[PDB]
Design an enzyme around this catalytic site. Structure first.
Site, PDB file in Angstrom:
ATOM      1  N   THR A 120       0.901  -1.042  -0.111  1.00  0.00           N
ATOM      2  CA  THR A 120      -0.062  -0.144  -0.062  1.00  0.00           C
ATOM      3  C   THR A 120       0.841   1.261   0.000  1.00  0.00           C
ATOM      4  O   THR A 120       2.211   1.167   0.068  1.00  0.00           O
ATOM      5  CB  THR A 120      -0.785   0.012   1.208  1.00  0.00           C
ATOM      6  OG1 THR A 120      -0.255   0.140   2.403  1.00  0.00           O
ATOM      7  CG2 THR A 120      -1.786  -1.212   1.269  1.00  0.00           C
ATOM      8  N   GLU A 146      -6.945  -3.272  -1.739  1.00  0.00           N
ATOM      9  CA  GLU A 146      -6.685  -4.621  -1.245  1.00  0.00           C
ATOM     10  C   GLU A 146      -8.111  -5.387  -1.239  1.00  0.00           C
ATOM     11  O   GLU A 146      -8.451  -6.119  -0.542  1.00  0.00           O
ATOM     12  CB  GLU A 146      -6.308  -4.663   0.278  1.00  0.00           C
ATOM     13  CG  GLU A 146      -7.229  -3.901   1.099  1.00  0.00           C
ATOM     14  CD  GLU A 146      -6.611  -3.435   2.480  1.00  0.00           C
ATOM     15  OE1 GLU A 146      -5.460  -3.444   2.577  1.00  0.00           O
ATOM     16  OE2 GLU A 146      -7.178  -2.432   3.289  1.00  0.00           O
ATOM     17  N   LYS A 180     -14.121  13.633  16.362  1.00  0.00           N
ATOM     18  CA  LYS A 180     -14.968  13.294  17.290  1.00  0.00           C
ATOM     19  C   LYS A 180     -15.180  14.362  18.216  1.00  0.00           C
ATOM     20  O   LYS A 180     -14.140  14.650  18.991  1.00  0.00           O
ATOM     21  CB  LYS A 180     -14.558  12.106  17.896  1.00  0.00           C
ATOM     22  CG  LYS A 180     -14.524  10.853  16.853  1.00  0.00           C
ATOM     23  CD  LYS A 180     -12.814  10.659  16.535  1.00  0.00           C
ATOM     24  CE  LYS A 180     -13.153   9.387  15.554  1.00  0.00           C
ATOM     25  NZ  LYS A 180     -11.535   9.292  15.130  1.00  0.00           N
TER      26      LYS A 180
END
Ligand SMILES: Nc1ncnc2c1ncn2[C@@H]1O[C@H](COP(=O)(O)OP(=O)(O)NP(=O)(O)O)[C@@H](O)[C@H]1O
Ligand SMILES: Nc1ncnc2c1ncn2[C@@H]1O[C@H](COP(=O)(O)OP(=O)(O)NP(=O)(O)O)[C@@H](O)[C@H]1O
Ligand SMILES: Nc1ncnc2c1ncn2[C@@H]1O[C@H](COP(=O)(O)OP(=O)(O)NP(=O)(O)O)[C@@H](O)[C@H]1O
Ligand SMILES: [Mg+2]
Ligand SMILES: [Mg+2]
Ligand SMILES: [Mg+2]
Lengths: 522, 522, 522
Positions: free
Chosen positions: C172, C319, C429
């Site tokens: 990756t 992937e 968050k």
């Protein structure tokens, strides 16, 4: 096709070429006919493989064998699966029509037949379609098997393949129907050999098979793989003696002359051996017979023990490896007198390694092992057939509930001993209870004037079946007296109805034909 | 039992629940009887799964279906394999004795039967043994299928299992013997659907199936999975119309009213549709028929093309998926006039993706693709049956040499087009050559007074077979004149022997029974 | 080892030798360098297989490739897996230390490297241990690849093996950590090719790949299998053009001169192509570009559509095959004006065949598809990697709950369209809600004086994270004015804190390095 070498496949060629012990000069003996060594046995197997390949046998073809216990049968046992073909074992004691049915059902490609069953093949030759070759086996130099073996070289490279390829197949006796085809793979046979060796070789001091034994089969050897013993013996590299015809005198000569220490037979052959006069002056204190036919009686066990013979019962049912149970006695039970030892040896035995063997009622509730509650035996093992060959209705009933249904009713106790009482199809359902026919048929057989008894069961339309005891006598004993004696033993009130018959129908093998009795007598 | 989630299994439930395109408001139509949506189709499938589970159907049981093309057949196609059971497709055009043979051979557990085949079941009901339930299907509210569906909820959790579990089974027509059972797994069906979609959907501008089409089957749909089209259509989420009885008028109404664009039939039904008067004032320039029965003739192709219909031939043989070849025309061949286009469309076509399709002689030498040399077709594909059900002799002959033997003689050319000439069992061996019976039977059929011709072959004991032409006529034309006309065409010297017969025996389906002709005429 | 021929294995050799369509005279073109045919491509593949076998490459060895898009890369793609070896694709845009890490991690046996990356290999040559050979590739006759190919014959018999053998591997990009190794098998690649062909070839009239197209890749081709397109194109037998270096002028010449109709790139390259002056007098109404890099903006889509280009977005994550989603427009949406069409084309798209693609919250509760609720995407597909290479902690977090966790937050609607909002690691968050950083960074980027913006999130110890907007400007615009403009749009009260930075750190590939920004700025 390329496979990675790390992946290991369980194959019979590994059973032959990677034994526990290999002795090149150990003897394979065919009674008074042919002695050779293991170093000759391997070359012979390779020659047979070459001959089969020359004959056109391939990875899917079928070879049927119809002969007695001999070196040739062991060579077939090992060589036919190694090629990748399938070995069909033909029960020569079936009627010729049943043999024709099995041959057509299996669709055999090659047939090897002894010169003794040639008249049987004469009746069943026109109606056979798939066989391209018959090879006649003989006990002299005129054998076609020897002629075919002597043309090839002793070099062969045995292929490897998937371990789930079918290796052997045979058919059941057929007491309840037509014969049923059962098959096993390479993996299953290898696992059965190793599991049984681990179970029986590790016993402390009784009933063990080790590398110093001499092995002679007394079972048909075309039925249940001869209990898998010829494979196991070959893994141990022990001396093997093959009798052939089963004449009690030649058997009692082969024991003694060859010093046989391990064998396996059925109660009838054991009784014939013990009752032969030549056995009265014979030493038997090295012999370990395994009795696995059916229901080893206590009197036979006691007489065999008094002859200083190591006798123990085994249980297998022709589609479970076959071995499922073997009697093994701990050293505490080796002190017990002959009566208690006979009681322990007559049982079916404890389950072998890697076997579940639950007792169950109907609906599958797994009854307790209290020692008197009886139910069908359901088993799981690495070496069980997955279904019946070309059958789907009976295959579906075989594996109901995720367990294999043997069809035998037994009670297990706290110590783990199993005692078969009857077959499921032979139980008598009076109102809601299952009455074993075997127990009361033994009760009636205890009479002095009774020759043989068979109990089937006759419908009452009020509570259910009512036992019917068909009795063949030798003397004059009266019908009422049977009922009176039955009331004197065993509660059946007045439900035990006894009928006197001239003869009791048997099957082709020799068991009692209860379905035929139901057809004749209601 | 616990399985790792990474391991993916190819299952039909993935075909239904993971389509190329899902449209909740797309219509499933059963001709003039029942319209519903895909969001109703899924709930219906789950209800049928619940009903089957309530009925006692398990992972090994068999459900047989005997009805016409309808929504119920698609629901069966999808629901029975998803449970894990096996779907047996019954050919309703076979004789009742053949249907009995197939039913006994397959050992079906449940039978769903239309109310139209009930008289057939009446003749074959006493002799059927394994069936515990018959469910009668009807076109009104009195259907037992609807009654059984309406009791269950539309929620069901479909299990996953091994992708090699058998899903469907059916029997061949039986022109050469008794019917032969062929079976396929979940993997094979999924791969066939994806491969055929990749092959036919990626065509540039001719003969393609896409997400905008409307699909109506005209093949039996109980034979070769209806060419796998009902699965493929369901993956595309296209509108599906099911006619039922195949009445040409109702078919020509369903086309037009429903605007059907994709279908598949056989040459006889196509001829009936084209010759119907109602088709003379009908627009056909949106229709793509696929002809896969047998031997699409050039005249029919030309007339269909002149009606502005996209017609192309496909080749499959009922145990190969079935699809093996599809005619695909490049854009250069789309310019060609009607004659050359008909010539190209009449061929069997090029092989589909993931197919080998070699031409071979006997002994397997892989003949060249020169365009005139003929040999048997041997194929390898992901979706071929491994053997015949409960058959081992014919299974052994099926996969001889590592390739599947179709039994059809064809010649392939440099461009890859395949042209079937005859069947292997129908070739005539004169001295060492294989003479196709089809070519000279067409030659004889070119006569004006000939109604039909069948060529079989009669032994000469000198060089081999000698063709025998059994001819049924409509007028008075003389035996010698057939031979004279045959000499005027085609070298057969004087070997073409012609016999006049009153009628030519056919099979139950409708093909010419050459084995029966050999039985009657030597 | 012997395998039964009936068992079919999905292999890449079947992808090459059993295509949908094979044209011997179709051209493979390497830009202005090398033209040959498919009948030369197959011989070249066999020659490369012979050369690799001569070099000592076996069924377990690893060959790494480091070059541009060319015929050699396609030949590697096909020849290395067919031998049974594993093809390691090296990302040449990584830093040399990262390339060294990947090379050591994969333990490559042979390295094929272009003559352009030789200076990079010079820095990373002492510290490499497992490589026994380097093969230098060149664009002239002095290429060592051509010298090695020209010594061998064009005949080779490709072995078959298990379909679960690993074929390809790559790493990756590593925006969030070190690169992660992902691998795929022969089965997975074949299934991905067929599934994507079924999905995109069956579209009615928009965005379809068919047998008449001409294919040119514009993605790196050493990353995600070039979206699997080189395999799919080879299955269709279409003309393939390989550009090499990606110079916009040479690309805009190859399109036009070669009449390329299908390609795939990333938004930056598409913007460069559209903004090049040579494209102002160029015809583009035959081009279908697939944009799959990241977040196709609406303005770029609208300008491309106004240039009469068929542009649609695709979603895959390196992937997962990689393809998971493709934008497909129904014919009703083909009427819509350019604005609505751009809105529909900019989305990530609907899931492809055989994909589940559920949206989920944390704890896995499968949030509804109402169109505004956002959650992580969890997928199941035939072509997902089972774990990471030599990693077990991240592999364990990858397949949590039985589904593959992509790590992207998206909302799905009733029609099935998916719209990615952000990455899971990039969500902010605040108290209990997840605020996407992308939306407010776009809001801030709408300012005239803003050059680029990155939002990360700074801890408050009271409710949670508080967004921090690091902004790089081109002009003088003041910190307070950013907050004022942000209050004028978007409720964030006073929580939007903006800091002016001189430069924003990027990664080796070119994406924004948020972890580095967190390291520098708290
Ligand atoms: N040690 C034993 N004690 C008691 N009964 C036994 C013992 N061993 C075997 N049997 C019985 O003998 C049977 C042997 O099975 P098999 O050899 O297939 O004959 P079969 O059952 O008569 N064939 P079939 O009629 O098709 O079921 C078992 O199923 C038991 O019923
Ligand atoms: N496009 C076609 N062109 C020519 N012949 C075809 C074509 N499609 C099918 N056939 C023929 O029709 C057969 C279809 O097979 P099938 O449906 O099993 O009937 P069958 O062969 O008569 N059954 P059986 O008698 O057991 O072999 C093929 O084997 C070919 O001989
Ligand atoms: N069509 C798309 N729209 C939006 N984002 C996309 C799209 N396609 C890909 N992406 C994003 O780009 C990523 C591509 O994954 P990959 O090529 O492995 O880079 P990477 O995730 O940065 N590597 P790593 O840092 O190890 O996770 C996806 O995970 C998405 O976050
Ligand atoms: Mg039995
Ligand atoms: Mg056929
Ligand atoms: Mg990632």
């Amino acid at each position: 096709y390329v496979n990675d070498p790390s992946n290991y496949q369980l194959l019979i060629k590994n059973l032959l070429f990677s034994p526990v012990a290999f002795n090149p000069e150990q003897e394979i003996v065919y009674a008074n006919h042919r002695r050779h060594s293991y170093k000759t046995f391997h070359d012979r197997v390779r020659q047979f493989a070459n001959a089969l390949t020359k004959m056109g046998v391939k990875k899917g073809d079928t070879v049927a064998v119809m002969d007695y216990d001999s070196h040739r049968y062991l060579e077939c046992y090992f060589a036919i699966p190694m090629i990748g073909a399938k070995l069909h074992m033909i029960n020569v004691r079936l009627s010729p029509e049943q043999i024709l049915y099995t041959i057509d059902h299996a669709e055999d490609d090659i047939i090897l037949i002894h010169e003794e069953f040639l008249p049987i093949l004469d009746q069943i030759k026109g109606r056979i379609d798939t066989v391209t070759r018959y090879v006649v086996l003989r006990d002299d130099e005129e054998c076609e098997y020897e002629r075919l073996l002597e043309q090839e070289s002793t070099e062969y490279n045995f292929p490897d393949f998937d371990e789930n390829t079918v290796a052997t197949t045979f058919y059941t006796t057929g007491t309840t129907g037509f014969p049923k085809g059962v098959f096993f793979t390479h993996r299953q046979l290898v696992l059965h050999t190793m599991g049984i060796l681990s179970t029986i070789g590790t016993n402390a001091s009784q009933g063990r098979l080790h590398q110093g034994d001499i092995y002679m089969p007394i079972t048909p050897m075309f039925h249940v793989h001869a209990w898998g013993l010829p494979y196991m013996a070959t893994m141990l590299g022990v001396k093997q003696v093959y009798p052939g015809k089963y004449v009690p005198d030649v058997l009692l000569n082969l024991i003694e002359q060859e010093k046989v220490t391990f064998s396996h037979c059925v109660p009838t052959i054991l009784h014939l051996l013990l009752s032969s006069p030549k056995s009265k002056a014979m030493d038997f204190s090295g012999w370990k017979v395994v009795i696995g036919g059916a229901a080893l009686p206590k009197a036979l066990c006691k007489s065999a023990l008094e002859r200083d013979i190591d006798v123990f019962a085994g249980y297998g049912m022709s589609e479970t490896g076959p071995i499922l149970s073997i009697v093994q006695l701990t050293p505490e039970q080796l002190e017990l007198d002959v009566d208690q030892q006979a009681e322990y040896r007559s049982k079916t035995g404890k389950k072998v390694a890697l076997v579940e063997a639950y007792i169950v009622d109907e609906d599958m509730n797994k009854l307790p092992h209290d020692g008197e509650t009886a139910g069908e035996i359901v088993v799981r093992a690495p070496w069980l057939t997955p279904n019946y060959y070309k059958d789907n209705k009976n295959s579906k009933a075989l594996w109901r509930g995720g367990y294999l249904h043997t069809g035998d009713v037994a009670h297990i106790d706290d110590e783990g001993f199993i005692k078969i009482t009857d077959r499921v199809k032979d139980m008598i359902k009076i109102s809601g209870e299952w009455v074993s026919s075997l127990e009361l048929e033994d009760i009636l057989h205890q009479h002095q004037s009774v020759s043989e008894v068979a109990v089937i069961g006759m419908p009452h339309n009020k509570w259910g079946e009512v036992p019917l005891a068909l009795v063949t006598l030798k003397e004059d004993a009266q019908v009422t007296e049977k009922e009176l004696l039955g009331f004197a033993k065993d509660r059946e009130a007045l439900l035990l109805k006894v009928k006197i018959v001239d003869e009791i129908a048997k099957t082709s093998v020799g068991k009692v034909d209860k379905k035929e009795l139901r057809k004749l007598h209601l």
